[PDB]
Amino acid sequence: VKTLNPKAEVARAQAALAVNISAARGLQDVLRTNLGPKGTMKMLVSGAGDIKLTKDGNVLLHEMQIQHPTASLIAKVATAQDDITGDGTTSNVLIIGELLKQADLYISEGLHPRIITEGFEAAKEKALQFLEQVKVSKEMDRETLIDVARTSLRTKVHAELADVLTEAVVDSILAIKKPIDLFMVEIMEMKHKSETDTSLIRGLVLDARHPDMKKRVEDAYILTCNVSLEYIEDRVKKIIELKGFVVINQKGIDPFSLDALAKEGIIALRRAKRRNMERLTLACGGIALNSLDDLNPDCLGHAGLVYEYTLGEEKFTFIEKCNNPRSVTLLIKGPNKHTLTQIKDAIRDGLRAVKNAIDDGCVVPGAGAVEVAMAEALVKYKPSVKGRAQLGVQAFADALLIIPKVLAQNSGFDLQETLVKVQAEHSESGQLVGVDLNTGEPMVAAEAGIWDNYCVKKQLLHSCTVIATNILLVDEIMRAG
Amino acid sequence: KPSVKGRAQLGVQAFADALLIIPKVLAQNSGFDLQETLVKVQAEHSESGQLVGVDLNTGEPMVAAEAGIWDNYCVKKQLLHSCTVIATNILLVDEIMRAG
Amino acid sequence: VILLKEGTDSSQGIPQLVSNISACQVIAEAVRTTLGPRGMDKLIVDGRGKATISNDGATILKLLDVVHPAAKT
Amino acid sequence: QMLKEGAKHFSGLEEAVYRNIQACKELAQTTRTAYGPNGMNKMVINHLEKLFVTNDAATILRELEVQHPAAKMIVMASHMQEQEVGDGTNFVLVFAGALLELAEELLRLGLSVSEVIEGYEIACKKAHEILPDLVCCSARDVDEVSSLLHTSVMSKQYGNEVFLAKLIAQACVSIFPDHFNVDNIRVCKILGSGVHSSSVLHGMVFKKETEGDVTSVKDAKIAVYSCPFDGMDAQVKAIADTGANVVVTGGRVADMALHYANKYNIMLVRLNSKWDLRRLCKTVGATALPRLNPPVLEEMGHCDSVYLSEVGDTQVVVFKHEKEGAISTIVLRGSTDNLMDDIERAVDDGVNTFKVLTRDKRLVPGGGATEIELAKQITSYGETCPGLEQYAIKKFAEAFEAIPRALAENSGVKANEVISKLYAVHQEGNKNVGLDIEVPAVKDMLEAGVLDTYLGKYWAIKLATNAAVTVLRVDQIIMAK
Amino acid sequence: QMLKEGAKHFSGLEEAVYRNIQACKELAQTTRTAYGPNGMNKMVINHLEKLFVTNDAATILRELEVQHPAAKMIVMASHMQEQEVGDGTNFVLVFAGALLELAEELLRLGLSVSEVIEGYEIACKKAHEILPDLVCCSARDVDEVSSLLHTSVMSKQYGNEVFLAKLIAQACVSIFPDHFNVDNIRVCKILGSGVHSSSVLHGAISTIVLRGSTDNLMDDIERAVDDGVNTFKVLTRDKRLVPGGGATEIELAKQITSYGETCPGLEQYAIKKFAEAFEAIPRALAENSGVKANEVISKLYAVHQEGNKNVGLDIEVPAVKDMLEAGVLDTYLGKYWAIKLATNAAVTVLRVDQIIMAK
Amino acid sequence: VLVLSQNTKRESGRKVQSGNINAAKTIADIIRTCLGPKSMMKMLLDPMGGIVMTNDGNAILREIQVQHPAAKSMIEISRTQDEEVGDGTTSVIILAGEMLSVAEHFLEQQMHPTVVISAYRKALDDMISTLKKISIPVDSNRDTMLNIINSSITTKVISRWSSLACNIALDAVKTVQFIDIKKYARVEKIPGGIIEDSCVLRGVMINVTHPRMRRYIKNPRIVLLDSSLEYIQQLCEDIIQLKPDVVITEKGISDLAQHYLMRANITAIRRVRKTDNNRIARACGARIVSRPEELREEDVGTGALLEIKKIGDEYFTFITECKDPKACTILLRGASKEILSEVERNLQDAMQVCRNVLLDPQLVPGGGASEMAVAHALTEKSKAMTGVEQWPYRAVAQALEVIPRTLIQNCGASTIRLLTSLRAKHTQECETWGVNGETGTLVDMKELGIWEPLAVKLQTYKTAVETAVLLLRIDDIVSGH
């Protein structure tokens, strides 16, 4: 038979399922080493000798040259888990992986894939519905928000200064919520000094070109200009007449133009990123005209206090006190640049964590606290469904118990042993029972502050089941044309 | 298993699952679905009682005590004993050392 | 994985001293004969033909193809 | 299929630990020989067939071809340490390795990597608390100044003149240290005569180009130029009107611009590095005059002495005796380029050490003394801190025993014997007790003079620690080929 | 670790079931060419340099070193069918192979070996029930005797003198049978002259002086001489002789196939398949005659459901014909047991999956 | 020596037939598992980067680069099956391959294809006769006519907007019905918006040369023109003398000709694709003419609404309300070109099934109900034919049972068991009984509401059988290097 073209691998019978399961399982274990507060970030080096050192699962699975068709799929799962929700990206990869493990166990026993799918699917729905019964109802409460944002910062680098950054996150999110929008929080990272100096400005932070231009304009009227100020004095005359004390140009400014601008007491900056210009027009309420002669006294943004202070030997232009207190800037002061790289990602998640916390009063006990619960629930839900379906549910419940296991894993404690304690304590205290590694024993996650957003868990089961099962159907790829 | 608790809970449960090999195999030597039959037999069992067994001659879970299918006490009793006992020992033997 | 590439021959401990010692000893021996009034001259050829008859170590060590660290010393 | 693509060397868990640790050990031991007056230099020759004979670890690592991930982390530790104070460059290296060595042994036993870090991190903060308490604060004061400078000059190739290099660096860093800066020190390596000829010039030395010009100008009116003197009369004539008897051009000068500057009796100097121009503007008060038309009399710096000395047989202009010379020049002298290289390498270090004093008077009795003390203290500390951490803490201290171990190593003294003896005599002679290589036996470092900077040790522990910790976490990393 | 011993070839499930069936089938095909009047002789030489050109399956199998356990079962069947009546010693074999052949197909479909066993046995018991209702009864009478003896002398080497050999076993087994028993017949192989020189020595113990050009020819004649004698014993002990030519088989295949239609379940397949084995008999008959089985059988079956039992196959003329009107009538008891032994043989072989051989 | 070329393969007899079959039977075992509501989507990967993960055999066979012609024909089978009734593309492939697996069974018994084909062909008619002999006539009626177009659009990327798509095909097919021609349904797709913006236009659509010309005409008398109006006055006078008001020029119109036609109130549309000139001459009745000198008042068609609308800033000319709107235009809207070609097909296939409810609304219960009855019927015919062919008949009939067998297979339950029980109740209670993949038990399709238009199954048997022919006929396949 020649339906394929020369050089076309074909998976057939159980062989496909086997390679697929192991595949997704392998990559699932490799990423399982960075889960938990004791996780370990990975250093991925592409061809150009690049060195990507991060803790987030998604990014990792986006830099690792995966040759496993299955793993590649597992990469698409972690992606849909980082784009829709974000944090926990890892958790998902493990679930789907462990899930396939339980299934295979059954398949090798003689059970047909289809019946197994129905089993898991039957548990999925119920699972998602259980998360709707175990979700902790709170509110835009500043307290709970601080707990979540704090727990999010943990298990990472900034875990050293979670208290500080968390606070800034809550404030920035409280001043950008209309319906929360993260595009209203400008994250500016700067080197020099420690990461304990991070402050929260309520305006813009650009990173006076001429030594004669004022270093601090009060009611500075920004005259946004996109065109270049080179080939001159006539262009400077048109600005002074339009009453523009602070001309933030997107292009370079002719050396001679700066002398005529500083002679008038005009504070003009040059070479401003297009993204900073648009942020200056949406905060101060200014209009960015292309040509220098299209500007007018009615296109000047109203600023309260525009000062240029040194953020580590580097003078930054702070344009805070804007007429619209809905545009805040989260300045990030820290040691090296690489450090701020990770940290900046922490805030990105901190803002998103608080964001969903206010937009959704859901806050379930993380740290597996939910996992174990759902597991025991399904275990008592399988006898009501019976049939080979009973197994599916069970397996889905056993797959949910991977999170708490991995927790006791990355911690060092006995995986199995701990599992028994947590499970025995969970069916005695309630849904608030979690796996606290810092104490080496199961504790009330809702008492330690360890909380997770509903969206996470919910979205989790979703992206998992769908894809996972689909990987049990594709028993042949065949590369042809 | 939920009473003894601890890592033993699993041991006991596993021992229970291992005991389910008899019914499975039966359906295996008959020509009926292994898992399928196990479910029906287990469901009915958790309803009628110790009288529910696997009647291959019918291809469905029936009452052993009714059909007249009964096993001596000594037989069963001796089965688990000789098994678990010897079985475990083999598990402890982590080495043997030989030659050629 | 792998500290140094396939070429950075690392000689530490003693396998470094030895080698450098042996070569230095042998190079010296070469001129060790040009010592005295009846020394043993050496017609150094520069591959291109030009043969140079010298008895002075310097002139000889400056006209020879030296490609060894401990030797160039 | 293949979990990862081709040409991707990976390592997980212990497998990685062994490799990382090993690579670091050999790299830490390689430079270990470059410690103390027994420092055995190395000869590294890059592609360009360039021979580098240095005793400084940093200089070694930054010249060695390192491609090993974890191994590169050691190059960073030595880099930062060299940028902090300079001294102790090798200290961090060796120590970093020992740590990993003791830690790895803990894992193979069954201990969790997590606890390892915690124990080590916790002991890193305890030590940073012990050092400041045990440290021996010294008195500025030329008497105390020479003491520290005299203990930073040894252990090198210029030990024959540890008395000269001491006074030379004692004079320079004591003429303009407002807040001292190691950048106001310009060292020159002039061949000719032994290092016992090194002089201290109060200013900045360079090389002129014109003869007929004034070789030795009194109160000169320096005018720093950067624009070429090529076309030449109006350019050189505009320099004679301002009263500039000394021209320091940045680029090349036209032959007609030289003959004119040679006729105006104006000493002209062409081909002046960009840094030499800046150093001349902050020493005499000259202004970096771009073009040759805007210079005036208020742009001319005053330099009481600008003569042409041919020390070592090479012409050199000495701009000494100024109003507020903020930058002095160290005139080094060497019989060979080899000795001249080593000397300078050490001179800079002393420049940094002195810079440490201006911002930290404290000092500790080096030679292993402090190490043993910390080891003693930390160990006891571990016994006071229950939990599996007690083991990690004590192990951390056991690492400090590698410093004096290396000391007696590069001397041929049985470590096992010298160490045991050191501790015993150290637990009675206190801090001061150390190891005197020149005479294999315990001795009071404070009395022997050997005193290191407190701040020098401080950073070392922190940098090395945090660094090592990182390399240990990333226990799984493929690549992306 | 090493499972059983050293060099102990074992198998389980598919691999096994297949090993056994392959051997049996092949062993059936080999002798399948020795059936019908087109029966072609075989040349078998033992470790004693002895050449035996026989056409009798039993004789053949008992000359071939068959160490293969699974195959041995086929050696017993031919042996037992040769002891009872003799004729059709190849009928029991071929059938056996077929049964297992259409059986393997069933399992490889997803059926239960047991359901396959139940069916074959249920139909087997049924078949033997149709045999007496179809068998052609008869009563000693030199008439029906010379008729059955003639159809018992054919399909053999000495078929050239089917007339004389007919009279030979006609006189003997009609001089002392009082309750006849072949233990009174003494066959003597006297090399020399053709087979037309055969005589009947008189008497509860008659000597049969046989004449044969060569040895192979001698054994061939004698082999069947016993066939005419044994068959006589059966008839005198059982007044029933079904019509052959494959007639009975087809009808039994026509009844069983429909019998499976009235009995659903996993038995249905096994049943209908069991009947498909009887079609192997008329298949072999055509085989030896070089006729297309597929076409001849289909035709035979059609007319068979038209002309009834009698309808058979006349090799001497590629076309269906009435066996009872053509003078073709075999022994009832002969066919009877065959279906029994064969059905039984195949079974035990199947129920045996684990075997620790050695090579 | 070399008969047919050099380095060429050569089969014969038992080698040509055997290969031809298996090749087709194999390509069938590739998508067979993709049949049913429990199919298993495969994930092919062409040598470019396009990973196509579909379930439709067609799209699957159109990706798999084939070599062996035998398999290629199979691709043609799906190319003819998906071009008619869409779905079932797999069914036909499965059968076609099976018919061969059983055929070869006779090729071993030695039964020349002729004797075989003849049967297969005569048997093919048997199924057909039976199909129309047991099919139920389901009522045009917009109500049911919709449930027929819907059940097809279901389970597709268009399923989301099935309802809308259903009506689209409903109105389209209900208009081109005079015998319903599908070659009058001009589909037009424009990017922008969602699939809910679609609609059905009653008239040809073109993709106002003068901004002052008539934007809409009450009684448009179009005049199809191919030639150009460029070099003009005389050419523009021969048209106006035909009492027109809209000139559809195929080529470009000169600026001059734009003023003359605008001067006489005549909307001129220059540069009109040739395809558009043919659609306007069949819907409006305007004869297409070459040069203008040949334009008379007879070639002038007639419309009832020619309005120019901006379908996305793109002013498309709408010549709707034609006298004979026998050629409608379906405007399909899609997020991209992928959801645009997909939705387009689902609509087209939908138009076909609907093209049946108005011509021959016959349909048979799915679940394989049809296949079984036919299989049971053909079996009867076998006994009514006897002869050697008596077996082949049964063979084919028993080959149609694969649909239900493979159906229950992808469910998990027993394939054989269900088969026995199937034929059973199927031989008693009519054909109303079919396989239920959701209950794993044979259920009365007719009563469950599962019915498939005869045509759908009509083409099925026809194709599958005919296929086995052209293949069985393939005597030899040489022609090599």
**Shortest Cα–Cα distance, D475 to chain A (Å):** 7
The residue among D355, D388, D430 whose CA lies nearest residue D152 is D355
Of the residues F33, F82, F89, F249, which is catalytic?
F89
**Residues present in chain F in total:** 481
Partners of residue B42 in chain A, C-beta under 8 Å: 386
Is B34's CB within 8 Å of A391's CB? no
Is B43's CB within 8 Å of A386's CB? yes
CA distances from F234 to A347, D177, F231, F256, F288 (A): 76, 99, 11, 11, 19
Partners of residue D462 in chain A, C-beta under 8 Å: none
Q: Are D243 and D297 in contact (CB under 8 A)?
A: yes
**Shortest Cα–Cα distance, D152 to chain A (Å):** 29
C-alpha span between A90 and A32 (Å, rounded): 7
Is E111's CB within 8 Å of B30's CB? no
Type of residue at E177: P
Nearest-by-Cβ selection for D71 from C3, C12, C69: C3
Q: Are F476 and F16 in contact (CB under 8 A)?
A: yes
C-alpha span between A72 and A27 (Å, rounded): 9
**DSSP β-bridge partners for residue B53:** B62
C-alpha span between E333 and E329 (Å, rounded): 12
The residue among F439, F466, F463 whose CA lies nearest residue F367 is F439
The residue among F325, F362, F445, F359 whose CA lies nearest residue F138 is F362
For an interface test with E, which of B28, B30, B93 has the most E Cβ atoms less than 10 Å from its Cβ? B30
Reported as type and span, the H/E element at residue D44 is: strand D42-45
Is F111's CB within 8 Å of E110's CB? no
Type of residue at F22: N
C-alpha span between F384 and A325 (Å, rounded): 92
Q: Are F248 and F280 in contact (CB under 8 A)?
A: yes
C-alpha span between D341 and D335 (Å, rounded): 11
Is F387's CB within 8 Å of E299's CB? yes
User: Neighbours of A (≥3 Cβ pairs closer than 8 A)?
Assistant: B, D, F
**Shortest Cα–Cα distance, E112 to chain B (Å):** 5
Nearest residue in chain F measured CA to CA from A111: F412
Which positions of A are catalytic?
56, 89-90, 349
**Shortest Cα–Cα distance, A2 to chain F (Å):** 4
Instruction: Check if C1 contacts D (Cβ < 8 Å).
Output: yes
Asked whether residue A430 is marked as a ligand-binding residue, the answer is no
Partners of residue D463 in chain A, C-beta under 8 Å: none
Is B39's CB within 8 Å of A387's CB? yes
Is F63's CB within 8 Å of A473's CB? no
Q: Give me F389's structure tokens.
A: 């062919």
Q: Give me A126's structure tokens.
A: 């119920």
Partners of residue A74 in chain D, C-beta under 8 Å: none
Asked whether residue F267 is marked as a ligand-binding residue, the answer is no
Instruction: Check if F76 contacts A (Cβ < 8 Å).
Output: no
Of the residues F33, F56, F130, F415, which is catalytic?
F56
Contact call for A and D: 3+ CB–CB distances under 8 Å: yes
Q: Residue F197's CB: how many other CB atoms inside 10 A?
A: 14
For an interface test with B, which of E108, E109, E114, E267 has the most B Cβ atoms less than 10 Å from its Cβ? E114
C-alpha span between F36 and F410 (Å, rounded): 7
Count how many pairs of residues, chain A against chain B, have C-beta atoms within 8 Å: 26
> What backbone phi and psi angles, to 5 degrees, belong to D442?
-65, 145
Does residue F276 have an active-site annotation? no
**DSSP β-bridge partners for residue D332:** D189
Is B35's CB within 8 Å of A110's CB? yes
- By three-state DSSP, how is residue D476 classified? strand
Contact call for D and B: 3+ CB–CB distances under 8 Å: no
Nearest-by-Cβ selection for F40 from A115, A473, A481: A473
Contact call for A and F: 3+ CB–CB distances under 8 Å: yes
What would the 3-class secondary structure string for chain A be?
CCCCCCCCCCCCCHHHHHHHHHHHHHHHHHHHHHCCCCCCCEEECCCCCCCEEECCHHHHHCCCCCCCHHHHHHHHHHHHHHHCCCCCHHHHHHHHHHHHHHHHHHHCCCCCHHHHHHHHHHHHHHHHHHCCCCCCECCCCHHHHHHHHHHHHCCCCHHHCHHHHHHHHHHHHHCCECCECHHHEEEEEECCCCCCCCEEECCCEECCCCCCCCCEECCCEECCECCCCCCCHHHHHHHHCCCCCEEEECCCCCHHHHHHHHCCCCEEECCCCHHHHHHHHCCCCCCCECCCCCCCCCCCEECCEEEEEECCCCEEEEEECCCCCCCEEEEEECCCHHHHHHHHHHHHHHHHHHHHHHHCCECEECCCHHHHHHHHHHHCCHHHCCHHHHHHHHHHHHHHCHHHHHHHHHHCCCHHHHHHHHHHHHHHHCCCEEEECCCCEEEEHHHHCCEECHHHHHHHHHHHHHHHHHHHHCCCCCCCC
C-alpha span between F92 and F400 (Å, rounded): 10
- Percentage helix, strand, coil, to 5, in chain F? 45, 15, 40
Partners of residue A44 in chain D, C-beta under 8 Å: 477-480
Torsion sign, CA atoms D360, D364, D367, D370 = negative
C-alpha span between D249 and D268 (Å, rounded): 7
**DSSP β-bridge partners for residue F444:** F433
Partners of residue C4 in chain D, C-beta under 8 Å: 65-68
Contacts 24+ apart (CB under 8 A), A132-135: A134/A364, A134/A370, A134/A373, A134/A374, A134/A431, A135/A362, A135/A363, A135/A364, A135/A454
Reported as type and span, the H/E element at residue D248 is: strand D246-248
| Resolution of the PDB structure in angstroms | 5.5
Instruction: Check if D9 contacts C (Cβ < 8 Å).
Output: yes
**Shortest Cα–Cα distance, D139 to chain A (Å):** 29
Type of residue at F306: L
Q: Give me F459's structure tokens.
A: 């083409």
Nearest residue in chain A measured CA to CA from D110: A412
Question: Would you list which residues of D are annotated within the binding site?
Answer: 35-36, 87-91, 154-156, 367, 452, 457
Partners of residue D4 in chain A, C-beta under 8 Å: 64-67
Listed in sequence order, the residues at least 6 apart from F458 whose beta carbon sits closer than 8 Å to its beta carbon are F128, F131
**Shortest Cα–Cα distance, D211 to chain C (Å):** 38
DSSP annotation of F71 = H
**Shortest Cα–Cα distance, E110 to chain B (Å):** 9
Partners of residue F416 in chain E, C-beta under 8 Å: 109-111, 266
C-alpha span between E211 and E222 (Å, rounded): 9
Of the residues F82, F126, F299, F349, which is catalytic?
F349
The residue among E262, E259, E286 whose CA lies nearest residue E275 is E259
Listed in sequence order, the residues at least 6 apart from F125 whose beta carbon sits closer than 8 Å to its beta carbon are none
Is D68's CB within 8 Å of C12's CB? no
Nearest-by-Cβ selection for F388 from E110, E264, E294: E294
> What backbone phi and psi angles, to 5 degrees, belong to A306?
-110, 95
C-alpha span between A136 and A374 (Å, rounded): 15
> What backbone phi and psi angles, to 5 degrees, belong to D309?
-95, 140
> What backbone phi and psi angles, to 5 degrees, belong to E114?
-65, -50
C-alpha span between F481 and F479 (Å, rounded): 7
Partners of residue E302 in chain F, C-beta under 8 Å: 386-387, 390
Listed in sequence order, the residues at least 6 apart from A190 whose beta carbon sits closer than 8 Å to its beta carbon are A207, A311, A312, A314, A316, A331, A332, A333, A334, A340
Please note each residue after which chain A is broken, C-to-N distance over 2.5 A, or write none: 178, 207, 231
The residue among A233, A239, A235 whose CA lies nearest residue A259 is A233
- Percentage helix, strand, coil, to 5, in chain E? 55, 10, 35
- By three-state DSSP, how is residue E212 classified? strand
**DSSP β-bridge partners for residue F188:** F331
Is F40's CB within 8 Å of A112's CB? no
CA distances from E8 to A84, A329, E2, E355 (A): 61, 81, 10, 9
C-alpha span between D395 and A391 (Å, rounded): 49
C-alpha span between C49 and E69 (Å, rounded): 91
Is B30's CB within 8 Å of E114's CB? yes
User: Neighbours of E (≥3 Cβ pairs closer than 8 A)?
Assistant: B, F
Q: Are D221 and D243 in contact (CB under 8 A)?
A: yes
Listed in sequence order, the residues at least 6 apart from F321 whose beta carbon sits closer than 8 Å to its beta carbon are F202, F203, F303, F304, F305
Nearest-by-Cβ selection for E265 from F110, F391, F420: F420
Instruction: Check if D71 contacts C (Cβ < 8 Å).
Output: yes
Asked whether residue A91 is marked as a ligand-binding residue, the answer is yes
Does residue F89 have an active-site annotation? yes
Asked whether residue E184 is marked as a ligand-binding residue, the answer is no
